[PDB]
Design a protein around this nucleic acid. Structure first.
Length: 77
DNA sequence: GGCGGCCGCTCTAGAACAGGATGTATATATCTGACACGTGCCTGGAGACTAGGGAGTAATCCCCTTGGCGGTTAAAACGCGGGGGACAG
């Protein structure tokens, strides 16, 4: 049970090995950005003619994270 | 007065049933011929010993089969039409 219980508690993590392969592809990200684009456009068509130019934004509060993927990258090299 | 319907009568046949037929199942009588016991060996395995070598086990290693995915087009499966053949006769 020391190896059974914690693996049983992981639900999305067991399928993460295949979900990350299937979902972090080019066409999936194209679909997920075009969905937000058409949502913004028809929501503004319903509401107001000007459209915002900002969608799917990320915040970067920590500067050492770039250093971390740099370390992972030249470890993989 | 004629004719269809109904019921009784005789004819015919399927089939259960009993008797004869002939090749085996048994009940002794007796032969008989290998069966197993006894005897006499004697020839091969067991106690004991010498020596050694191939596997039991440990370690490594690298290898290769199992799980585990999407993808995609070959194909299993469901179903309709029908068609020629398995089988009863």
């Amino acid at each position: 049970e020391q190896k059974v219980f914690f693996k049983s508690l992981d639900h999305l993590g067991l399928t993460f090995k295949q979900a990350d392969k299937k979902l972090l592809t080019t066409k999936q990200l194209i679909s997920e950005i075009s969905s937000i684009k058409v949502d913004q456009t028809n929501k503004k068509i319903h509401w107001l003619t000007p459209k915002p130019k900002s969608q799917l934004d990320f915040d970067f509060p920590d500067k050492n994270i770039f250093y971390d993927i740099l370390c992972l990258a030249d470890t993989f090299i």
